[model samples]
Target chain A: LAVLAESRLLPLLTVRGGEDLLGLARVLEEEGVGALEITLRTEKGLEALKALRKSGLLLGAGTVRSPKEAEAALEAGAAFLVSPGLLEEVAALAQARGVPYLPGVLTPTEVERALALGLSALKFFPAEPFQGVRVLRAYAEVFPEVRFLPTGGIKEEHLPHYAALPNLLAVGGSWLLQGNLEAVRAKVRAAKALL
Target chain B: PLAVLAESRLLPLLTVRGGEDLLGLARVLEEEGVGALEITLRTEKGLEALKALRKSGLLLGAGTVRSPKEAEAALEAGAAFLVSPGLLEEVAALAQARGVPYLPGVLTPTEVERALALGLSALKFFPAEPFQGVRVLRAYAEVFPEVRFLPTGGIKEEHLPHYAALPNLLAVGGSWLLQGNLEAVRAKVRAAKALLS
Candidate 1:
């Protein structure tokens, strides 16, 4: 699993194509960050997933909301699936297909319900408002074995606070890729040093 | 009469899970100036309590109602209006068919668009802080000036000033109403009302 990798910080680079998609993946790989997540937000997002799949880089799909999306992403060679919230039908499909799916959660009920459905690894979406690091620590104490990939409102400075947690598998960051390739490389290098 | 009653007092929308703590909490809310109550159907005993409250002449709305079936059950149990965590086509249609006022939840621009498309002007901002605080409300107000928002989740009494300042906000929901402090609740309400004034 990508979670077991030496580097704990997984920068989920959400790529929206104005140019070639594989070119973006190559840039991330060159910058020493191998893991990337392409959100299904654009017309060419799935095609970009297919393009990145053939490049032999660590890849996953995001913002997937239904069973159809899960099937499409898996068929496009996406190794993992992520959604903003839990959809039972979609989670079931991911389990049946043997693909790792991280469903988004916020509340305790959502967390317990997802656990009931056999999901240990999850994504904590919109992390800042729900107390960020403190909230993750509380959840970790209760569900110690469960791993979380915290996303949204995560800045470069916020990386150290999240990456230090034992329960946190990876910190999903967009800060590195929000700027130019050189800037992104600098951010990644700094993040790598922190890890 | 319904609108007049709704306007009279702070409607504390309470979620009654299968627990005794909520029943005690509801009783405490009634003792306060909150004449209107919204018992969310997010739990098993929601409809039963709604029935009990209606029989007692308590003005009650139903919360977290997501389907036509749930709407039908709530209406039969005498719910004044239906509230959902998120808006759905079938649930909105059901609310319309039953001739009930519905306050559906909206979190993003897409959700706001969907609500406007369905001819809804009233919405609940579920998990309000994460959806960009008062800034998001201001942006939505620019596009849908006619719409009114009921801000819910993680709202504190201290945060009431910022919420009240927003022209688009109709009412703010907080757990402070059921906080088991009568003097504090009254003081908070007075301060909140003064802010709106």
Candidate 2:
């Protein structure tokens, strides 16, 4: 969580095999982005994790579904773990290791479950579909201690409103992945400026 | 178990500010063939009202219960079941220890999986409108056929037909039945009971 706590933007990378994995890593490092999440969605995701770890970028394993995957992520040097939804067993694993486990939460019930397992910082997956900032604001009022990293459906325009919340830890989205090598510098800079 | 569902599927939630004429309201609801009601802990007098309604002989539940302390208080005050906005561990552990029926709220499959691991089958899908109403429930139905939902929040009279049509919807929870207008509340209860049947 220190990795996430240190930075304002935590970029989510879903790298396919043909994509320039090292090139993206180099850009992320050069741009001074503190952390990166390599989701297991694509085949080359674990490769990117190992590469990023060796490159000294704080790595988080994303879209992790099971205990085995979580175990593998830690072995690959993930500083933290993220899940699309609450995976209690994986949550248990991350808890045992003392790493941050930002399990996806949508309702107050999910929030309670996460808190019960000793994890408070949560990911609002498909955040836009879950009513985005308004719903997040309601949760902030209800659960004062909870922190959020909104991951899905967020665009560059949503940065100011998201950063304004007292409970926001960071914002994660693929909007940063839209541009080329030269365009990424200003994109990362613009994202950082909002925070 | 199916025993509660077999008896009544409509879990009318009560959160009125000053409406505490328990016997009259309970009798009116009982006459309309209403099965169970949940009195929220939102109001200070809710527990007292639940205690007063003990003699009414209708199935009563406690709502908006957020902690184990509240669970214990609700049980001590004569609530037959407990409904929490979220799955607080202490509350779940307490409910399990007491053999009480606890329907904690949920919104994602991950929460559903965890609740099932904790031996809970019946669940509450809260803020039903924000969760895309019955559409998500339909998807959940296909994914977890064994699970049943007590869809609460943002459920209105017109939403009843769509909610009631689902096979996996065990019951519907609403605060509309406890409005200040006594006769109007009675009429709504009558209509809701009719739809539930």
Candidate 3:
């Protein structure tokens, strides 16, 4: 799974309540892409997580802000946790629970702090404004073993550049789902080809 | 009367660039009934003025405290609390070692979480206006209920009610108190109190 994700062949999921995870999962499963992340930013995000769990979908939770939210997501059967920023208490709690938590980070200081707390996999949020590709490239030089999932503001047009970065485990984009289902499927197929 | 007036008024946390016209600035603030003063160590005379203000019995705190050395200096100079623009592990550890209250700045959930981990209960929400003003504070209030916020930056007299309404907000700071007018400062304080009341 890591190999496929690293190679950009798998579709990384981002759930925001309106998307039909069960339907998307079926499609991705059929397409041989089997990783999903449900963001807790929406009102029905937790419910979506529970639904995805029941549907036997490979799922993780995003937008985890606090220890309570992390615990709730873990209790809801989320396979992993992702946040927009590094919260030490949440990360510590997730660690105690033995959950793989990907905390969001921007600066070198934040990355060092997150690494100190035993997190090697992270999310670079609001990626574009922070010098997306350049920042990741710099971090890749310093922390070679660390992996990242650059999420926010990523579009389908920028897939090739992100795919070429060796340190990027995956690039998450909502562009594939922006169009109609069939169009989205085609875009995903194209994205798979780029991988 | 002074304590009542001081507690009832808004304290503007001004960052002094290089201690230029500080005494004049202090006198102007004093005339306006603005008693609480937070002098940032980002300037050269920050520690000296903090000591002088402490000697004068004015409520003083040291702002932009980033290291244990600075924290010790501020404490020795009689600062009541230490204020930092952002929390660093070294500074936080120093504050703990020194037994001084440190009000660290927080912008995102991660920063707040780092503060909470360090066992800090109070924090500064710096450049508050840029982070969606009251809306961001509302979200933080929901997430970190026990944490108290001192909202600073881009605050005006009219923004008092929104901050006062929040349970997590302890105070709001701005240049409203030191509009460079003694009469204006007093008037602004009275108006700020009325908003809070």
Output the number of the lDDT-best candidate.
2
Writing each residue's lDDT as its tens digit, candidate 1 over B131-176 gives: 5566657645533567788877777666666766687876676555
Stretches of candidate 3 off by over 4 Å are A1-21, A24-33, A41-43, A65-71, A84-99, A106-120, A156-160, A173-195, B1-19, B23-38, B42-44, B51-61, B67-81, B85-101, B105-111, B119-197
TM-score of the first chain in candidate 2 relative to the native first chain: 0.93
Worst 10 residues of 1 chain B by lDDT: B1-10
Q: Native-contact fraction for each model? A: 0.00, 0.59, 0.29
Compared to the true structure, candidate 2 yields what TM-score? 0.63
Residue A98 lDDT, candidate 3, scale 0-100:
79
Q: What is the C-alpha lDDT of each candidate?
A: 0.71, 0.80, 0.71
| Colliding pairs, model 2 | none
- Clashing pairs in model 3? A86-B110
Candidate 2 per-residue C-alpha lDDT over B1-197 given as tens digits, one digit per residue, 9 for 90 to 100: 43654456677787646646778888877776676788888766889888888778678888888789989999999988888877766788999888888888888888889889888899988867667768889998899999999888767787777776677888887777676566987788778767765
lDDT of 1: 0.71
**Clash counts for all predictions:** 0, 0, 1
- Order the numbered candidates by TM-score, best leading: 2, 1, 3
Q: What is the lDDT for B72 in model 2?
A: 92
Descending-DockQ candidate ranking: 2, 3, 1
Could you give the interface RMSD of candidate 2 in angstroms?
Answer: 2.7
